A paper describes a structure:
In trypanosomes, the key enzymes involved in the provision of these reduced molecular species are dihydrofolate reductase (DHFR, EC 1.5.1.33) and [name] 1 ([name], EC 1.5.1.33). This evidence supports that the concomitant inhibition of both DHFR and [name] enzyme activities represents a successful strategy to develop novel HAT treatments.
The structure of [name] in complex with the cofactor NADP(H) and PYR was obtained with a 1.34 Å resolution, providing a detailed view of the inhibitor interactions within the enzyme catalytic cavity. The crystal asymmetric unit includes a whole functional [name] tetramer, whose structure is highly conserved compared with those previously described (subunits were completely traced apart for two surface-exposed loops including residues 103–113 and 143–151, usually poorly organized in [name] structures). The binding of the cofactor is essential for creating both the catalytic site and the substrate-binding pocket, where PYR binds through the peculiar π-sandwich between the cofactor nicotinamide and the aromatic side chain of Phe97. The PYR amine moiety in position 2 (atom numbering in the inset of Figure 3) donates H-bonds to the Ser95 hydroxyl and backbone carbonyl groups. The nitrogen atoms in positions 1 and 3 directly interact with the cofactor, forming H-bonds with its ribose hydroxyl and β-phosphate groups, respectively. The amine moiety at C(4) donates a H-bond to the Tyr174 hydroxyl group, that is further H-bonded to the Asp161 carboxylate, a key interaction within the [name] catalytic cavity, playing a prominent role during catalysis. The ethyl moiety in position 6 forms van der Waals interactions with both Phe97 and Pro210. PYR fully populates the biopterin-binding pocket in three subunits of the tetramer (chains A, B, and D of our model) whereas a reduced occupancy (60%) is estimated in the fourth subunit (chain C), in which the population of the cofactor is also reduced (60%, consistently with PYR).
Residue numbers in the entry:
A (entry chain D): 2 to 104, 114 to 142, 152 to 268
B (entry chain B): 2 to 103, 114 to 142, 152 to 268
C (entry chain C): 2 to 104, 114 to 142, 152 to 210, 217 to 268
D (entry chain A): 2 to 104, 113 to 142, 152 to 268
The structure:
Amino acid sequence: EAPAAVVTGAAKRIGRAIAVKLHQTGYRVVIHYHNSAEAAVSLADELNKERSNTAVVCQADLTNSNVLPASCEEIINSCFRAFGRCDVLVNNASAFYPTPLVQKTVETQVAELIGTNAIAPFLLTMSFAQRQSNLSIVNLCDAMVDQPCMAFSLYNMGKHALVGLTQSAALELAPYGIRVNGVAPGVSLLPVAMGEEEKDKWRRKVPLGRREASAEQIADAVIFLVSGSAQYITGSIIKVDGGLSLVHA
Amino acid sequence: EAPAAVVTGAAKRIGRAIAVKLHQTGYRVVIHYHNSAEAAVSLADELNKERSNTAVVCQADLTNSNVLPASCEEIINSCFRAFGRCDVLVNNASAFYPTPLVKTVETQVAELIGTNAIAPFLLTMSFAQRQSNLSIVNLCDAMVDQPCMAFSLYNMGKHALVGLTQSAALELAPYGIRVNGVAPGVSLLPVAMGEEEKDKWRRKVPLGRREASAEQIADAVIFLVSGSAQYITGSIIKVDGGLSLVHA
Amino acid sequence: EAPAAVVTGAAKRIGRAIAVKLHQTGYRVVIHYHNSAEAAVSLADELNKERSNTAVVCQADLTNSNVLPASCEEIINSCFRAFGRCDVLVNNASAFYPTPLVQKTVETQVAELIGTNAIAPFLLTMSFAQRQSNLSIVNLCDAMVDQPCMAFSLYNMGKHALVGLTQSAALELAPYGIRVNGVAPGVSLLPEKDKWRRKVPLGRREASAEQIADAVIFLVSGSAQYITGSIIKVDGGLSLVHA
Amino acid sequence: EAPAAVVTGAAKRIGRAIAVKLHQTGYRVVIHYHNSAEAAVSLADELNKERSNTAVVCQADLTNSNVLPASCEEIINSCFRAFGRCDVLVNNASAFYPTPLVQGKTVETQVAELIGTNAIAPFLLTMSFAQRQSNLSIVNLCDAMVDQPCMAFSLYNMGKHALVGLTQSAALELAPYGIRVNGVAPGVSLLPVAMGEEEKDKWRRKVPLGRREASAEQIADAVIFLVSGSAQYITGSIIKVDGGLSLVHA
Ligand SMILES: NC(=O)c1ccc[n+]([C@@H]2O[C@H](COP(=O)([O-])OP(=O)(O)OC[C@H]3O[C@@H](n4cnc5c(N)ncnc54)[C@H](OP(=O)(O)O)[C@@H]3O)[C@@H](O)[C@H]2O)c1
Ligand SMILES: NC(=O)c1ccc[n+]([C@@H]2O[C@H](COP(=O)([O-])OP(=O)(O)OC[C@H]3O[C@@H](n4cnc5c(N)ncnc54)[C@H](OP(=O)(O)O)[C@@H]3O)[C@@H](O)[C@H]2O)c1
Ligand SMILES: NC(=O)c1ccc[n+]([C@@H]2O[C@H](COP(=O)([O-])OP(=O)(O)OC[C@H]3O[C@@H](n4cnc5c(N)ncnc54)[C@H](OP(=O)(O)O)[C@@H]3O)[C@@H](O)[C@H]2O)c1
Ligand SMILES: NC(=O)c1ccc[n+]([C@@H]2O[C@H](COP(=O)([O-])OP(=O)(O)OC[C@H]3O[C@@H](n4cnc5c(N)ncnc54)[C@H](OP(=O)(O)O)[C@@H]3O)[C@@H](O)[C@H]2O)c1
Ligand SMILES: CCc1nc(N)nc(N)c1-c1ccc(Cl)cc1
Ligand SMILES: CCc1nc(N)nc(N)c1-c1ccc(Cl)cc1
Ligand SMILES: CCc1nc(N)nc(N)c1-c1ccc(Cl)cc1
Ligand SMILES: CCc1nc(N)nc(N)c1-c1ccc(Cl)cc1
């Protein structure tokens, strides 16, 4: 039978491209979404038009709270309910906004930024492992974590914690045959709210091509990590950043 | 006038040695503690016997919760109320216990990610908002990239603290606040640990086959807050006897 | 036309596996060797039996010396002469032995360890770029570079230098569309063996040269067109394991 | 009896600052130099005027060659010859110039100079320091920007990366001998003498902490900490002294 993957935040942008490319590869997919119901449903319909019964949606808020463990367990359970197995988890969903140190509550910001970027990946990892071929987890990291944007402390803290998770889970889950790796974009699809002049400023920084990564280029690295061509790779984080992280101030 | 410092988890072990050394250097100290009230008060009394009105205690749980921002604002405020200034913040307090992937898990998240990362972040916000050689020192972990098995939430917290160190160094540089870390390998070993297990850790350390004293950790904190470190920000100094360089 | 690749130290072990997989992928290949002429020619015979005139050999000593720049220019030129193009350079050749700090001359050891592991990759990079589509260079790094083996100072130095070359050349050659990346094995083909295997988290799977070659195939592919300056560890998780 | 230190490339700039601060701390010093004879002697005269017989000069080219091991052995021997002991080695001397990958000295001369001064001579001096053997240590002058390198400086960057590898490998292997091995990694400190003020200001404006380069004494302060008793458990560590520069994105 066909393997099955969960992709978080899969309705739009990079998560959509990952879900598409996994499906093209032969996976059945759970399209997790939070607010983007119409886009999630439209994607599942597109994938099911290609092969019936190969895509479902699953709604969840991945903000940290006392029920986040239950929500994460339910996302994994939704893959077993639909497809009878769960071979790949892709932790893609992520909040991003500034949290300046000097002048939503700050605890809501902690819950959203650390919850989506770190705690939900951790809880999803627990539930993936507990509910258990070529099993693997891919975490969407950030190649610029050590040269961060000013005023983004909580986002940066969350992405650093996700590197720690990737490493710790690779070590702990290797005996169960589950590999755990990361893909670290530099700039890929730019923020919807960002003006054209600012987008071009970011583009001009990238050595390879002076352009952002497509979503498909990011997804290409995810497909490699889940493939049989990566069977001895665990704990690794692949930068897909066009050289951006090597550029000095 | 004498500068003042806040040290979190200062009643015992490394945080106690840091508070002692800061005091010996000339700082007035806030000794934060959670459960260890008798040891925090005994330290305060020792330091005030050495020089009157130079130490106070401040109790707080640094577990993450809806009240943690207020608690961290109150720790910093305690230094201003006692001493009229707050020049140094040492984020030392830390929960450490296994969280296997295969207390509720959300309590473990609150304790391990709150003490190791969120409380340092909120303390950093409160310190900066209240603002000469100002600096913050974060107690990191030199083994964060070769972590102990089954310690994912602790490791996640310590990685998040590296990110805070860097992000806060960059954002607080314009205000003249330096932000750095000290990363022990093994220093004071857990008190429950049998000597046979302690000796196994000691044997791994290239430099002397022995754990760091708390005082050796504190010496790196004293350097980073001193005028000999005035250009250092965003740096994490390993104090690990070469342990992180040892392969499996 | 089919793209072409140079693989250094391609007669045996990892380099041989890389050459085979590039050839299977559709590359024409230059098989570099120093001492292993019989194995280089045996490999070329196997590859040419599959597709005629798709594999040649090239002899060079990659020890640093006054003639190393000309040797490296000749390896690159051999690819252009055989195949009319040179799309991929894999810097695989490497010397490995201990050089204790406290007690071949030490300067011969510098020439071999630093020359084969770092300087010849630098000179090959220069010649590859100067003679220039999906162009890329892949350097064989070491996943244990920051947890080095005791008494291997010069080997470790040269592998660190190779990381610096990977990064510096990625930046400088990006405007030319040449990507520069690394693959960092941990324990692959062993030179006591069991001791090492039991420490690898993914130790249920034997380490293989083909697994290393798979990462090289990804990095040279169109699936890696935005990837430059990246070093992929292929080590079963070994570098995550504390002492 | 006062401890003794060797500082390479100590006639001017950062290496002079390091020699001066070690001397102020109580060390006797060997001021190594290559071409800067007048500045080396000037400095040793100043230090000797402060306390007699506490500074000597030693001349040596640190370019790689088949004689480099003998030169490095001789530098260490000069410390024992003058002072009877050698407690600290500071590997400061360093060539720096561009070596573009795509197109005067031959490339092999550039290799010998850039990799010799930045890496091979530190390795040979480390071997001779250890063989000739309490608070013994080595400090290597690294570069905080080694992972965000300047365009066209590949050989310099390769040499600094190799020096990180040496720092770590020598820390591990020399720990049983009680010799600590650490690094200090400037971002921008004293700017090139050839650089125009406009270009210097471009660099200064990038630095978060103060929008200025490190003084030479700020770099020396980190060296003095690492050789001190306050660092007695620290080995294999590289301290950035960079004002936050390495944290700044493109
Ligand atoms: N784009 C880049 O250049 C870039 C650069 C560096 C790293 N990355 C990483 O790559 C991944 C994909 O980036 P992207 O730009 O495609 O991300 P994005 O568009 O900013 O976010 C992806 C999705 O995350 C989901 N999400 C946000 N908050 C959530 C919450 N509270 N609960 C559950 N889901 C939530 C949202 O789903 P709904 O729309 O359904 O609400 C959203 O569509 C992220 O991890 C990002 O950090 C991207
Ligand atoms: N010891 C080592 O070898 C070592 C190795 C690597 C890193 N480090 C780091 O170095 C720092 C000091 O280490 P240590 O061994 O001295 O630490 P420790 O003894 O484990 O803990 C220090 C103090 O943290 C406070 N703490 C724990 N949970 C708390 C909470 N919920 N709220 C507030 N405070 C809390 C406790 O204060 P009360 O007693 O008052 O409750 C405790 O005494 C830590 O950050 C540790 O991670 C140490
Ligand atoms: N095996 C592993 O586990 C492992 C681990 C970490 C990193 N790596 C990296 O992976 C790559 C391939 O490793 P491997 O074990 O397959 O290497 P290997 O067999 O030790 O050597 C590869 C080839 O390099 C060539 N070589 C050595 N010294 C030379 C010189 N002076 N001039 C020219 N060529 C020379 C030799 O070719 P000839 O036989 O023709 O003379 C040799 O067959 C290396 O860069 C290595 O450092 C491997
Ligand atoms: N300045 C900075 O901003 C900065 C930034 C990053 C790293 N660093 C590192 O910090 C250290 C000191 O920097 P600096 O700017 O003071 O260095 P520098 O002025 O460029 O060079 C220091 C000395 O190196 C000696 N040297 C050069 N080539 C030599 C050779 N072939 N043989 C022997 N000695 C040789 C020269 O001695 P003579 O004059 O006697 O010939 C020179 O005075 C260097 O390792 C540098 O890489 C500095
Ligand atoms: C808002 C898009 C976004 N979402 C998430 N989850 N993470 C990010 N790192 C970004 C991001 C992308 C490009 C730039 Cl230039 C800045 C931030
Ligand atoms: C329990 C002491 C402790 N507390 C905290 N906060 N962090 C740690 N990293 C440790 C610790 C020290 C030595 C060993 Cl061997 C293991 C863990
Ligand atoms: C001789 C094989 C070899 N050659 C080179 N060129 N580099 C290496 N790192 C090794 C190697 C492989 C396995 C072990 Cl355990 C140690 C070293
Ligand atoms: C020429 C001074 C110099 N010498 C050496 N040995 N290394 C360096 N890294 C520099 C240097 C300092 C500042 C700038 Cl901006 C650029 C280079």
